[PDB]
Amino acid sequence: TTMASPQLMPLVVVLSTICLVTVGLNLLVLYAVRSERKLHTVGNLYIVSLSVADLIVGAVVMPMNILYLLMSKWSLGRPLCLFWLSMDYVASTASIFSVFILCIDRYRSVQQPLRYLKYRTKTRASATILGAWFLSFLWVIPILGWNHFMQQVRREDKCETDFYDVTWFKVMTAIINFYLPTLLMLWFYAKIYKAVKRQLNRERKAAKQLGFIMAAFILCWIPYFIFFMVIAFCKNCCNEHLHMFTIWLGYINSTLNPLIYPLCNENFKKTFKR
Numbered sequence: 001t002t003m004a005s006p007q008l009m010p011l012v013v014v015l016s017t018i019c020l021v022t023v024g025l026n027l028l029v030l031y032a033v034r035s036e037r038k039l040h041t042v043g044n045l046y047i048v049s050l051s052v053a054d055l056i057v058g059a060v061v062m063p064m065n066i067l068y069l070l071m072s073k074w075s076l077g078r079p080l081c082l083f084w085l086s087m088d089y090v091a092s093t094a095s096i097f098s099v100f101i102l103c104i105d106r107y108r109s110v111q112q113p114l115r116y117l118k119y120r121t122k123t124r125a126s127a128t129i130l131g132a133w134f135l136s137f138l139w140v141i142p143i144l145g146w147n148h149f150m151q152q153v154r155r156e157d158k159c160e161t162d163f164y165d166v167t168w169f170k171v172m173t174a175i176i177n178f179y180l181p182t183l184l185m186l187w188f189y190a191k192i193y194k195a196v197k198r199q200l201n202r203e204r205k206a207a208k209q210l211g212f213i214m215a216a217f218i219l220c221w222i223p224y225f226i227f228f229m230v231i232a233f234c235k236n237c238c239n240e241h242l243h244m245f246t247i248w249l250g251y252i253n254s255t256l257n258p259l260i261y262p263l264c265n266e267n268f269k270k271t272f273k274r
């Protein structure tokens with residue numbers, strides 16, 4: 001019945017725990033924000049956007065990915081697989097765009113906290129978050145319309161994105177979506193950290209929070225992306241174990257961010273203590 005060998009259970013039994021902990025922590029963060037007035041700041045809007053993206057990548061893709069791992073097939077509804085892809089790619093890129101927006105906001109604030117003050121109303125933070133989410137949801141077009149744009153799954157042993165066999169698009173979208181946000185974020189973070197070390201202490205807790213979030217990303221997703229852009233050329237080169245572990249390393253990052261917040265802010269630990 002497309003089962004898995006009894007030696008593949010002792011890891012799914014903990015993947016389910018990771019799935020439940022991701023949605024038990026992100027939901028806790030979200031309820032913390034909507035239960036206390038002190039947490040309706042500007043950067044907490046970006047934190048909420050990140051927590052929502054992690055809730056989606058912990059509640060929609062985690063159980064579907066676990067079921068796909070346990071049952072090595074996806075003859076389980078073509079539109080359902082399309083929805084899983086459209087809620088995996090969009091969530092994973094929305095997390096990295098929300099982090100990018102937060103990093104730009106903090107870099108503008110640390111630029112000079114006398115010139116970026118009239119562009120920090122919460123309405124504009126919400127507008128930027130909605131714009132980032134729109135750019136993320138733009139990922140629906142290629143997945144659902146590659147058979148319409150390029151005159152080209154038809155593979156029922158496993159459902160996959162329609163451009164998996166398109167090396168040029170894969171490498172180009174990987175380069176853009178990861179590297180350019182990653183490079184820009186690293187540049188902004190270095191520019192922040194220089195000034196923060198320069199002046200002086202809430203700055204050396206907020207800078208550490210942003211640095212830990214960025215470290216989480218650039219250190220838990222890059223094992224996936226280096227493999228993704230080395231596999232785009234090597235075709236006799238298909239180690240499934242490393243790929244399957246790197247994807248779940250990124251998912252562990254999604255789980256870790258809700259643990260990152262308590263250990264970098266006192267307000268979050270004060271509202272998590274009860």
Ligand SMILES: COc1ccc(CCN2CCC(Nc3nc4ccccc4n3Cc3ccc(F)cc3)CC2)cc1
Nearest residue numbers: 065068069088089092093096170173174177178221247
């Ligand atoms: C059981 O076997 C399987 C086999 C396959 C799968 C799919 C796993 N899925 C996991 C998440 C992956 N996201 C992803 N790849 C990308 C390639 C180019 C551009 C963006 C890409 N993005 C989104 C992203 C964006 C920024 C970022 F910082 C991180 C990611 C896509 C793959 C699941 C189970």
